[PDB]
Structure 1
Amino acid sequence: MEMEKEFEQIDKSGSWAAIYQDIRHEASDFPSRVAKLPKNKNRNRYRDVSPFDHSRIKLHQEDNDYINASLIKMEEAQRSYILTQGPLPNTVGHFWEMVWEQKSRGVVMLNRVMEKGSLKCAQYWPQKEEKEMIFEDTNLKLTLISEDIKSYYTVRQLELENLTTQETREILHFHYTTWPDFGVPESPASFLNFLFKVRESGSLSPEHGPVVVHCSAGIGRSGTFCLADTCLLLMDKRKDPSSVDIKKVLLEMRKFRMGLIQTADQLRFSYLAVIEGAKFIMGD
């Protein structure tokens, strides 16, 4: 069923809350035993948001390999994403260790450091060229190279150095700065423009490690970003683009991380983004 018609049918009937609860009920439940070990309590931002054991990213160290991060592997679309929480004061070194070890080119940030008057993630990147950051626990150095500030997003060029080998890599930081403190954006235009920019950078392409995507919990806005990207890629690859079922794609992604899409309004926004996006895809 063409999703645009499914959309108008749900909107006219006002059943968004009903559809959303059906997804919640059918979603996968897999063990997260490593996340719940007492040694890992200060590595989790939220008690109710944990990576599944089968899909968690492992840090390459013998001490403690745990980070709150999941590998989302979309077999038909040929895309992989790492979805993670906003880093905590004691996990900023783990975060950059993961980017290094997984060979990521891009980090996608969908939150502000402060929202609703509270801290939603650590200040984990340098704000001035001449004041670099050193992570002594993981032996990394991070330098701000350049910053491009636009109305709806900021792009940063960062240099990450493995202090052990003196190898360096260029990381691109894509920061969406205008998601509202409450609800979802009224139009998906600026969100789609932003995805367009991440794609154009090479950050989502198979010659690199998976993109790292985060918000505060790494399930809501983060969920919306990967769901929209994968649905648009499938509409490009298939003979019958109308066969793309956004609810079935979301349930496939929920095999790899719990809780993706946190509200009925985020579900409606994801539909709106894909419907508008495909327009820009089908010759326009």
Structure 2
Amino acid sequence: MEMEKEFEQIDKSGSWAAIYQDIRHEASDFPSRVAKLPKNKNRNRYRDVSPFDHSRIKLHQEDNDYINASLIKMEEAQRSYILTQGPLPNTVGHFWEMVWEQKSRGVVMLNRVMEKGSLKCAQYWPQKEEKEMIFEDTNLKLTLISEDIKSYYTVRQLELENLTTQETREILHFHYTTWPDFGVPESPASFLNFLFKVRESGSLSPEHGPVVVHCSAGIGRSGTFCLADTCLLLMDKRKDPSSVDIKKVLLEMRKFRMGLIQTADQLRFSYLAVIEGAKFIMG
């Protein structure tokens, strides 16, 4: 079926939970043996969210190459993304090592450091220009260059220096600051505006390594971001845009990381975002 009318048909019939449970039943199951090794317990935020062995990002290190991060490679859309958990106190150096080694330009953050009165990820970037951060375990230095605070999101320019080689690179930090503590946003308008700002920066384009996207677990909000981006790109590429099937795209992405889209409300919100976004691209 088309999307917008499949949408009203699920709303009127109140069957979002049944649709979402079908997706969960059909999703891929692949091994995650490296994630479950005992030496990696303090590298995982949640015991039930792990990268598959076949698609995990490897750190260029001979001691321990493990990070909780997955490469999502979308062949028809010609887009790639790295989805990862929010960094932990003992993985902030690994996180920036990955950004460096994978040649990423942008980092997309969809959570606040504290939500619901608890810590959802480490304070992994500097908050003042004159107070830079050094990650001694991976030999990197990170400096805040500029910051632009808007009503729904903040954009930061960061400088990452590899201290072994003295090479430097500019990294863009795109921080969506207004996702509610409970549920999903009422309108997708600010989320779509944010997606378009990431796109306009070059961070999603083939001349750079894959964008790094995270929330707390790296599967819920993060899944919504890449699902919406890929569906809108396919609608631009194909002769028949109504052939794009959001449930099929989501199942394809779940071949590369488990659990993408965590609730039926996130599924409905993804439909809403793609539907509204398709009108702005053109109508």
Which bracket does the TM-score occupy, shorter chain normalised? over 0.9
In 2, Cα distance between equivalents of 1:14 and 1:96: 43
The Cα of 1:3 is off from its aligned counterpart by 0.2
- CA deviation map 1:51-94 (0-9, x unaligned): 00000000000000000000000000000000000000000000
The Cα of 1:217 is off from its aligned counterpart by 0.1
The Cα of 1:41 is off from its aligned counterpart by 0.1
SS of the equivalent of 1:134 reads strand
SS of the equivalent of 2:57 reads coil
In 1, Cα distance between equivalents of 2:50 and 2:164: 31
In 2, Cα distance between equivalents of 1:155 and 1:108: 10
SS of the equivalent of 1:39 reads helix
Mind listing any 5+ residue stretches in structure 1 that lack a counterpart? none
- CA deviation map 1:9-62 (0-9, x unaligned): 000000000000000000000000000000000000000000000000000000
Equivalent in the alignment of 2:272: 272
SS of the equivalent of 2:108 reads strand
SS of the equivalent of 1:182 reads coil
- CA deviation map 1:145-166 (0-9, x unaligned): 0000000000000000000000
Q: Between Structure 1 and Structure 2, how many residues are aligned?
A: 283
2:46 corresponds to 1:46: yes
Equivalent in the alignment of 1:92: 92
In 2, Cα distance between equivalents of 1:216 and 1:11: 29
Kindly, what percent of the aligned residue pairs are identical? 100
The list of structure 1 runs, each at least 4 consecutive aligned residues, that deviate by more than 2 angstroms after superposition, is none
The Cα of 1:282 is off from its aligned counterpart by 2.6
The Cα of 1:236 is off from its aligned counterpart by 0.2
Equivalent runs, 1:1-284 vs 2, <5 Å:
1-283=1-283
In 1, Cα distance between equivalents of 2:17 and 2:214: 25
- CA deviation map 1:225-250 (0-9, x unaligned): 00000000000000000000000000
- RMSD over aligned Cα, in angstroms? 0.3
The Cα of 1:122 is off from its aligned counterpart by 0.1
SS of the equivalent of 2:157 reads strand
- CA deviation map 1:126-159 (0-9, x unaligned): 0000000000000000000000000000000000
The Cα of 1:100 is off from its aligned counterpart by 0.0
Mind listing any 5+ residue stretches in structure 2 that lack a counterpart? none
The Cα of 1:281 is off from its aligned counterpart by 1.3
SS of the equivalent of 1:68 reads strand
- CA deviation map 1:230-274 (0-9, x unaligned): 000000000000000000000000000000000000000000000
- CA deviation map 1:178-217 (0-9, x unaligned): 0000000000000000000000000000000000000000
SS of the equivalent of 2:66 reads coil
The Cα of 1:96 is off from its aligned counterpart by 0.1
In 2, Cα distance between equivalents of 1:197 and 1:62: 37
SS of the equivalent of 1:41 reads helix
Q: TM-score, normalised by structure 1?
A: 0.99
Q: TM-score, normalised by structure 2?
A: 1.00
The Cα of 1:2 is off from its aligned counterpart by 1.4
